[PDB]
Design a protein around this nucleic acid. Structure first.
Ligand SMILES: [Ca+2]
Ligand SMILES: [Mg+2]
Ligand SMILES: [Mg+2]
Length: 430
DNA sequence: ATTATGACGCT
DNA sequence: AGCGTCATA
């Protein structure tokens, strides 16, 4: 009753760019705008691999991971933009730089946590309190929420999409009690107003559209964001959780999309997130461990406490390349040449990072994959990163992996290498 | 023969 | 430390 926490203490948003790499390319090349199009890397093997897809192209069934030649079978008029290649490898600089554009705008509104190249969590709790003070018991107009969906509404006693959206929003606003500044539902609504403003700022100042979720924690904000894409935002209230979770596959919740999620389904014999409520905390801890068990017990009730971390910059800077099938590296010279290529890109990015962000990396991590190994990484070794110099870094990387070479012949490398990875870690202020 | 990333947990 | 899991475009 009165002592039962409800996880309604914070307002958290998740902002995620729509078909991000595609929008970056469409901004640059107006011929690609409002067309079925995709971004691809490499070209020789089956037309290149697709890594991002416009919503127009998704209507034909085009997806990420598809070979472009195969995508063309579904969508013959598909337009393509290629990722830049430098030093023999895909170079993602343009997209990293576009990401910084967006993150810097978001940072004007609130503390953000960079969750990937195109998404960030926002802790709006303080901003909401401030806005509520300005408002002074003043009602919130639907006009302030022109692209917001309220999950679960409309309900109870129009056949068009926008019509339904407004009906739900009207029901929601009709109900609100703007008289109480501590009302969680009111707080979420003010959060959503701010996020409309944030999203408008992003589009005005970059040209990029995005979707967003607004809820009381990161997991629900992430889930909410995906409910209405593209170019829309969704508010998931605490009260919406039981119905939302009653038919929500477990795998849709962040962190449950893999083996742990599969085990929750198998061991408990359930399919939907809501079904978890019937287990005690101790039962869940017994199967999934102390940490996971407590997390699941709260999460299935819509409660999660993971904080929005104050971190706008990536914690590592890495460079990696696969060498699949027949392209695997089989000579020492090959291995050294490609380590150099990677190290040169890494040096370039590190030097820029040091100038922009007043920090220096202190550890170099070297990782490789050997032909036959099912695992993505076969081996990982670290050494000191004491100078931003590509020849030194490549020489040092070779030193830490050279003993992996089975070949009795110094000149030959066996088993051939199917991946190389250099990563700078452990930053210190500079 | 998806590839190129990046955060965090376990022991 | 080195390995594994889960996630991004
Ligand atoms: Ca996105
Ligand atoms: Mg994303
Ligand atoms: Mg995606």
């Amino acid at each position: 009753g009165p002592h039962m926490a409800t996880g309604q203490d914070r307002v958290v948003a998740l902002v995620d760019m729509d078909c991000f790499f595609v929008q970056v390319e469409q901004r640059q090349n107006p011929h690609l705008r409002n067309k079925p199009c995709a971004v691809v890397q490499y070209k020789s093997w089956k037309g290149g691999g697709i890594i991002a897809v416009s919503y127009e192209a998704r209507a034909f069934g085009v997806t990420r991971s598809m070979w472009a030649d195969d995508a063309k079978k579904l969508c013959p008029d598909l337009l393509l933009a290629q990722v830049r290649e430098s030093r023999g490898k895909a170079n993602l600089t343009k997209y990293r730089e576009a990401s910084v554009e967006v993150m810097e705008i978001m940072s004007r509104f609130a503390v953000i946590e960079r969750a990937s190249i195109d998404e960030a969590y926002v802790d709006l709790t303080s901003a909401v309190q401030e806005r509520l003070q300005k408002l002074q018991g003043q009602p919130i107009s639907a006009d302030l929420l022109p692209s917001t969906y309220i999950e679960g509404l409309p309900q109870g006693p129009t056949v068009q999409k926008e019509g339904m959206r407004k009906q739900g929003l009207f029901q929601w606003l009709d109900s609100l009690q703007i008289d109480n500044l501590t009302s969680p539902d009111l707080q979420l609504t003010v959060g959503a107003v701010i996020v409309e403003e944030m999203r408008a700022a992003i589009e005005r100042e970059t040209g990029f559209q995005c979707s967003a979720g607004i809820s009381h924690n990161k997991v629900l904000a992430k889930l909410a964001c995906g409910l209405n894409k593209p170019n829309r935002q969704t508010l998931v209230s605490h009260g919406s959780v039981p119905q939302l979770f009653s038919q929500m596959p477990i795998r849709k919740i962040r962190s449950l999309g893999g083996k742990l999620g599969a085990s929750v389904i198998e061991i408990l014999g359930i399919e939907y997130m809501g079904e978890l409520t019937q287990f005690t905390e101790s039962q869940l801890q017994s199967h999934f461990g102390e940490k996971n068990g407590s997390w699941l017990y709260a999460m299935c009730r819509g409660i999660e406490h993971d904080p929005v971390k104050p971190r706008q910059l990536p914690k590592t800077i890495g460079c990696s390349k696969n060498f699949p099938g027949k392209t695997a590296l089989a000579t020492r010279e090959q291995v050294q040449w490609w380590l150099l290529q990677l190290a040169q890109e890494l040096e370039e990015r590190l030097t820029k990072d040091r100038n922009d962000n007043d920090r220096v990396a202190t550890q170099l991590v070297v990782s490789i994959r050997v032909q036959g190994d099912k695992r993505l990484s076969s081996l990982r070794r670290c050494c000191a990163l004491t100078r931003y110099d590509a020849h030194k870094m490549s020489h040092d990387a070779f030193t830490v992996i050279k003993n992996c070479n089975t070949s009795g012949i110094q000149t030959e490398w066996s088993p051939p290498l199917t991946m190389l990875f250099l990563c700078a870690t452990k930053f210190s202020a500079s």
